[PDB]
Design a protein around this ligand. Sequence first.
Ligand SMILES: NC(=O)C1=CN([C@@H]2O[C@H](COP(=O)(O)OP(=O)(O)OC[C@H]3O[C@@H](n4cnc5c(N)ncnc54)[C@H](OP(=O)(O)O)[C@@H]3O)[C@@H](O)[C@H]2O)C=C[C@H]1[C@H](CC(=O)O)C(=O)C(=O)O
Ligand SMILES: O=C(O)CCC(=O)C(=O)O
Ligand SMILES: [Ca+2]
Ligand SMILES: [Ca+2]
Ligand SMILES: [Cl-]
Ligand SMILES: [Cl-]
Lengths: 412, 411
Amino acid sequence: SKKISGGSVVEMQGDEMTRIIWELIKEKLIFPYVELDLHSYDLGIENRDATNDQVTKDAAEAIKKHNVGVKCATITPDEKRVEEFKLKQMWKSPNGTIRNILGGTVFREAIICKNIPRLVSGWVKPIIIGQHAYGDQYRATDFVVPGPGKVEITYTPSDGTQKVTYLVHNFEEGGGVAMGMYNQDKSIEDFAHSSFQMALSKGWPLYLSTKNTILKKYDGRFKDIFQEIYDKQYKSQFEAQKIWYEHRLIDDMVAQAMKSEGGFIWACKNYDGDVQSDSVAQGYGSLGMMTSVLVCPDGKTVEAEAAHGTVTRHYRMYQKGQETSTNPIASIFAWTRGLAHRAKLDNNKELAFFANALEEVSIETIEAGFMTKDLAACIKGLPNVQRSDYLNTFEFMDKLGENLKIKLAQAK
Amino acid sequence: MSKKISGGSVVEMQGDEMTRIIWELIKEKLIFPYVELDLHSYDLGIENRDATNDQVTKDAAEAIKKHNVGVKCATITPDEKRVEEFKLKQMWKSPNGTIRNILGGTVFREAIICKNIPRLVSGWVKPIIIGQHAYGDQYRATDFVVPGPGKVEITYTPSDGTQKVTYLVHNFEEGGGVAMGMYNQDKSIEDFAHSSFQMALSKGWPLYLSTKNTILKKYDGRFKDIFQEIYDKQYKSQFEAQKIWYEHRLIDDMVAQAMKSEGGFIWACKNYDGDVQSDSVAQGYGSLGMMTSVLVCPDGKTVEAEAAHGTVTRHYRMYQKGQETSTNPIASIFAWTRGLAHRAKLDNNKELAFFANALEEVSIETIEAGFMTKDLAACIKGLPNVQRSDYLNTFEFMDKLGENLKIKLAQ
Ligand SMILES: NC(=O)C1=CN([C@@H]2O[C@H](COP(=O)(O)OP(=O)(O)OC[C@H]3O[C@@H](n4cnc5c(N)ncnc54)[C@H](OP(=O)(O)O)[C@@H]3O)[C@@H](O)[C@H]2O)C=C[C@H]1[C@H](CC(=O)O)C(=O)C(=O)O
Ligand SMILES: O=C(O)CCC(=O)C(=O)O
Ligand SMILES: [Ca+2]
Ligand SMILES: [Ca+2]
Ligand SMILES: [Cl-]
Ligand SMILES: [Cl-]
């Protein structure tokens, strides 16, 4: 009779074809059933340029205040984009910026449809990657070494005691490159807690990967912190659910994951999580069918995003009124994951039911054979797909909407 | 009369535990009956590395520079438990890391494929060869704990006496943590590029380099720029003539594209990525342990072929108690065959070249005929379904290879 009152959500609008899909999702799938107190931040490239990227920081601050953010894919400028949009600077990726402000762990997991074939034969249960969202390469200082000379890294305590100087390399034959990077104890502790809690929440074992055989001090610190927290705070809960936590060397881990059946949480350092989550998503059948949710250290704030790109080539055709077949699932599940968290915070049973029903309809629709071109290509091979094998962007969104209406009405 | 092949000079690095047992069996049953060698042997077992404060590892690397061919048995890389088990003077670094740091070059890794061993990744009908840059980055880094608030900086002091340059790494104001510095060398990157372009041209396959230059714009940008300059100026015409190409890819794009591909390309990897992704790729072809690993040095004349991965401690303990084991020797065998094949190339030795290939063929044919160790039978049937009649123990398998090798060499 009346729409679900859904509460406060921070929306981060994006670019190009994902921006188009984003507005379709709202128009056809969300707003006909849900009324929201939407706090909207335009992270389009033109508004980021207009505001000297201030809108991105304001959006992150709004997520802290309202505890739920949902983010559309954005352009990370390069030189070509600077020329295309006459940018004032080559602005940094909003995702890096938001993650650095909020902190936490990005959990990434495939979105699985029975008729979309896996590439890895054994993966019959899901693999959830928890990517530490702070530090390491993403805050590093790198530079070109122009010629022979010495590179050192130093630590000067703030409390006035004596410095320590570590030789990096004496460049004796030429130049090269060098870099320093760091991470913080508290961030690592938050990463550990989020990983143990996720594993207990799903009832799956947890592995952390490092390369502490080589980086005995840097990666040893991750290994040590996880083990201490596990022993003192989570081990008895794990044993009660008959699950476990173990550290693994990263190269052992990627091979162990390859040969596994799935069904574990995989805690990754920032870089490894960035890389391995794409490998895993592709192994489940489609790189694009993936959820990506930043879980912040306060245990109450979340940011759900559509991972990967803005699909520029489809946007160019759309702008010319040409037919496209853009997969909206990752954008839809950014909304449903955000709304499901909003519902849990508010004990809003109607919104929780809605968010889960939309995820069900999305998967059921694809499983009934209605699907965009990229998914049909998973089944038949891309050079072999014909027009009758798939739905265009609007046909697919319309089929979702008609299936969502049926699902919500049947439950009433 | 009856004669053996005159094989020439080879540097041998002996190793630890079960791989050491297998190593000696390979020489005794498979190499020495057919090949005479000028063997320059270095004991890289954990006890002798400790006794020499790791000097033997350096001596062995220097011997490879002299004789241009090394073959290496798997070695223990000590952890806390190994330090206690052998009362070590230090948690010594991996010998492979030390040797690679001394020799430099590119480590090429590739699956050893048997028709009856199923892949885990559906589309991989052709091989993926990873060229792992073998020098620098995380494997020569300096890392440390930050015990509390304070400033970490990194500074460059030019040799020529001009003014030093200092960059702020991090101001720790809320606690402690960790930090590290790493580096790489232009000349080493250039050698890595040359080896990668030459390997692609020798195979007739395209070449991809992965980096994360979106994030490390100077450090990884330097890899990208050196590769592109060397390509444009020295190899692009030859690539186009063979209808292949070179392209840079972001590492997270590359791992997904690799997993969705059919194979058939060279994948140039920075040290860390090559270490990690070569294990993923070998496992994806069916068996982590079936892989070749050959360090190709920058001089274009020196190689070190290694048995990659572990020493199979659990089998070694069983062996020490007189219990039956089923230890796969293929990776150790192919270290010898790849080393001898390069030796044959340097010396223009057709007999040695024929032998090295024959041993590889015998190894593959034997497994494809249904004679293998337990690990491989588990690839086919699933470990819970493997019975004794599904496999050969360690000595039965080596003897089967011996008999098939004798037959093959009788043309
Ligand atoms: N690095 C990326 O990937 C990211 C992309 N961006 C921007 O997005 C724009 C374009 O990016 P691009 O690389 O051009 O990819 P795109 O999204 O166009 O997809 C290529 C082809 O895949 C097919 N395809 C893709 N999606 C769909 C779909 N939904 N439905 C159907 N087909 C699809 C289609 O195929 P076709 O049908 O055309 O044959 C398309 O063309 C640039 O501004 C980037 O900055 C944003 C963030 C990064 C993040 C990290 C970060 O910076 O914060 C990241 O991942 C990393 O770097 O770590
Ligand atoms: O070198 C080591 O420490 C173990 C061997 C290894 O990791 C490898 O061969 O890839
Ligand atoms: Ca990425
Ligand atoms: Ca390794
Ligand atoms: Cl359309
Ligand atoms: Cl035996």
